[PDB]
Ligand binder design. Structure first.
Ligand SMILES: CC(=O)N[C@H](CCC(=O)C(=O)O)[C@@H](O)[C@H](O)[C@H](O)CO
Ligand SMILES: CC(=O)N[C@H](CCC(=O)C(=O)O)[C@@H](O)[C@H](O)[C@H](O)CO
Ligand SMILES: CC(=O)N[C@H](CCC(=O)C(=O)O)[C@@H](O)[C@H](O)[C@H](O)CO
Ligand SMILES: CC(=O)N[C@H](CCC(=O)C(=O)O)[C@@H](O)[C@H](O)[C@H](O)CO
Ligand SMILES: [Cl-]
Ligand SMILES: [Cl-]
Lengths: 293, 293, 293, 293
């Protein structure tokens, strides 16, 4: 398996006005990430790709398009989690067949699952596909002791590589890197990249890398080298941009920024607001002028 | 449209060991509810039916089976909500075509939706199907004032009939019944049936009515008549049973209780633990002896 | 022992502009509650009396004044809880010496205390004073079994009479009455009086009874009689008043309502805003016109 | 002004078996911190000093003893916050008269205060004492823009120097340094010292520095120098010790660790468990053997 460390953009998907996938636009998003953002890889089918609002067939179409466009140019991780474990296995088999470098899967949601149920979910996707797996932060933890024990149980299956860490708990992060040093951690909070990199995370998966990949790489590399003053200056500008994106509407703003760079990033998928308002477009133009020009 | 007030069992589904639907067992669950539990209706495809772990085709199969088995004997509500609005419209059209009396839909989940997005979701399902709709408690409310305003906006579409109330806020419940007296409220907390009925809820949708329908009807009717001392005695026994069911595993325990009554309630669907442990079966036998014998 | 069931106003305290106690105004509030609100008793030194913003000497002054003004006309409960257990024992001894009918004490706060620490706190106040005690809802519970288990442990002390229930969990409320039927429960949510009375609470302790005591008694007695239609109409009017009070500022609005009836309820104590704005006074007059005229 | 940057131990207080202050033991704790832990200063009267369980006179006694023992050898900050603003002003005046270098004050608690009330509280303590102030993280925030907005409002008072940051939000931490670069931030989470120092905090206030001050200074200074590999190794050992301390009981374990070094750290104050169990003492000795020998 290919090196999975580094900067991964969580791939946004271009949709048409009617909610269908715009394949031409999706390929332009992929090309922008590989050629201009210079990412180490793409994280396909995650939250950022508006994955959970789509059919199984649409998810397969996006996996097809991303692998065909990226080829072997960069590493590709396929997020295949679902509340439906049979769907997660089907998507995991498909992504495996397409050649994805590894799978990832959100914790099953909508119902409250016990830890044994979550571990069985991951072990089943791994056993049925034969692919390695990146897990997600374990929900509803009451303590770090329990958190480390549970990662330790997930981490009994040798095909579990590590975790996409979204919890805002740097104590737990430090504990996990100490207890399981050979397992990888990818930061899942772009606005907290510096402190995560200071604790030795192995990479980052993020939605804002679709437009801010240059600064994201700089923060990560400078931090690993101990150049914290400069890394913080770049995190400050990055977070001014991220604060504006969050206030204006996360996926719509990143798509509107991509449109200003000549990428046909399209609409969002309903039930999310599909069309950016004039105000949202106006704010996206201002953010591009201030931070990406 | 048929009367939708009263006691609705949230229909459990029988699954085989491999996770597929057991149609014979599902028909036995339906017959037990209509003939023995004497419910006013069934709420099909809800959380209790393990709906969100299933494919769209499986959901359609369950809607087919429930309508064919129940015919016009009782009222039938179809829960068709999803994170995928195109799926919710497809399921809503199918349930409408089958003759369901009304639709219901959970709030779109997994992402955080704004109120306008939630209202557009409901208005879209209604517009595309032509069916009336029961909404779910609005998530993440910061106040009752906002809650009532938002119900008031949902309640601008004349085809929204009312709400399946799951929030444990009887102040909000009272406010909603006062502000919108012609809109219905169904209690969605079996262990809080008495206090809900004391505030004039119009019915209840519940998972434990699959086995405790007799007491549920008694609590509801006695409470509406002002016979609170007796209603509370029956709520006390009901809650001893419900406390045992919750501690032992909700859907598995209700299925194990149904098996003790000769109903082939089957297994649960994975990622939920599919097979009851010997201990879980043992606890289900004890609950049946104490409360349903 | 002096009967502690029924309607208890959580006594408000009148403060001067400089924050000192206005004894004449406090006596007028007491007289209003006894003579006009027709309460069964007063709950002195609770949250509503702005107790936690005061010195130990000020708390003693309020206990002295309330007992001297009320004499033996009504029941009197003294809230003496604190984060400082030595202070709670001092106040408990003083209220006992003055003749208060029972003590009550908030769970020790600020810090996170274990259940054994909370039980030792209550047992210490009781042992050092010789007085009966009303406890408060146990915080940070994870389940009803454990909540009930812990109330059981508190109730092993025969001098613990019951609880002032503020938690918004009517399943827990029902479980408490099921488990410990001889122990008392006072509702601590005025806007949820009807549903609480439907579950058998023995009385209610509330801030709004200082001005709405007549309706509060009607809701309680009508609900106990099973006259739910009439009780619900009075709860509806009551909750229109409570909604307005809460939106305008709880403490300041009840004091302004008392001022309009000729009770010198004075200012609030800092760090709470001490004086009402012109807009707050205008809204309070509108509430008086609509609901207390 | 006296430099307030660097490592500040949140001073523990020694209590006798009866809960009274053990002045000799308190002086030994102070001496240990100054002479052995090599702290830059002490934070007196905070959570760690068990302040909120004490009377106003006891708080004054601790302020007197700490200033008399420390004299002018180190920097001294006095935490004087309370729910009682008159008490906070009294304590602020006393600590100012004694020569403390700065005041600090927890957000008023128990009740829910508005932002204007919190700002008036801080402005009142400052105006009545003439002393500089360190505020606490603002509670119940809904967003970073509003959190930053409110710190801006507090910082309009030139005597507010910065904040003791306890919130577990490093995005907010970064936004605070971006917005108000000349204002100070002290980290209040010992186990997250490295990532906090990576974001430019100016110092740290902690309970574990009473026994782990040598490593705490190394983490802070190494991180500021960009020596992350070395700082992370020391944070790893530190967090092994902190994890054990937290699991065994924070207050009691640090006092037992001090007792093993010959410091009469005494008992804890009730309502906290005053004496360690045999198991707690055994575990504390194991922690001393492994990490402080
Ligand atoms: C919840 C969320 O959005 N998390 C993103 C992680 C990307 C990811 O793993 C995914 O899309 O599944 C972050 O990039 C995030 O968008 C960004 O930090 C802004 O908050
Ligand atoms: C969250 C949950 O389980 N709610 C049930 C409501 C049923 C319902 O509307 C559904 O299945 O969608 C209740 O019957 C519940 O199972 C029962 O009260 C036990 O807690
Ligand atoms: C949190 C709070 O204010 N609870 C009150 C209970 C009063 C009480 O027991 C006290 O003052 O200690 C209620 O009366 C409340 O004021 C009222 O229901 C309006 O919300
Ligand atoms: C909540 C708490 O205890 N916070 C401490 C900060 C100490 C402080 O500022 C105080 O005592 O007021 C931390 O040192 C903490 O004890 C330590 O990080 C272990 O969790
Ligand atoms: Cl490892
Ligand atoms: Cl209406």
């Amino acid at each position: 398996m290919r090196d999975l460390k580094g900067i991964f953009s969580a791939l946004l998907v271009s949709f048409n006005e009617d909610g269908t996938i715009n394949e031409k636009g999706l390929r332009q998003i992929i090309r922008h990430n590989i050629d201009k953002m210079k990412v180490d890889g793409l994280y396909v089918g995650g939250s950022t790709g508006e994955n959970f609002m789509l059919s199984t067939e649409e998810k397969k179409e996006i996996f097809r398009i991303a692998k065909d466009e990226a080829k072997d140019q960069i590493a590709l991780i396929a997020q295949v989690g679902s509340v439906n474990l049979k769907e997660a296995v089907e998507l995991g088999k498909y992504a495996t067949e397409l050649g994805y470098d590894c799978l990832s899967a959100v914790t099953p949601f909508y119902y409250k699952f016990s830890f044994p149920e979550i571990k069985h979910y991951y072990d089943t996707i791994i056993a049925e596909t034969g692919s390695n797996m990146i897990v997600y932060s374990i929900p509803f933890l009451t303590g770090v002791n329990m958190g480390i024990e549970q990662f330790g149980e997930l981490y009994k299956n040798p095909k579990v590589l590590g975790v996409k860490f979204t919890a805002g708990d740097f104590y737990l992060l430090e504990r996990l890197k100490k207890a399981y040093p050979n397992h990888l951690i990818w930061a899942g909070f772009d606005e907290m990249m510096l402190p995560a990199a200071s604790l030795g995370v192995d990479g980052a998966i993020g939605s804002t890398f679709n437009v801010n990949g240059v600064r994201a790489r700089q923060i990560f590399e400078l931090t690993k080298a101990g150049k914290l003053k400069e890394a913080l200056e770049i995190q400050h500008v990055t977070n001014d941009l991220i604060e504006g994106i969050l206030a204006n509407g996360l996926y719509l703003t990143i798509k509107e920024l991509l449109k200003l760079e000549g990428v046909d990033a399209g609409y969002c998928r309903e039930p999310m607001t599909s069309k950016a308002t004039a105000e949202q477009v106006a704010k996206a133009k201002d953010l591009k002028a201030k931070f990406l020009s």
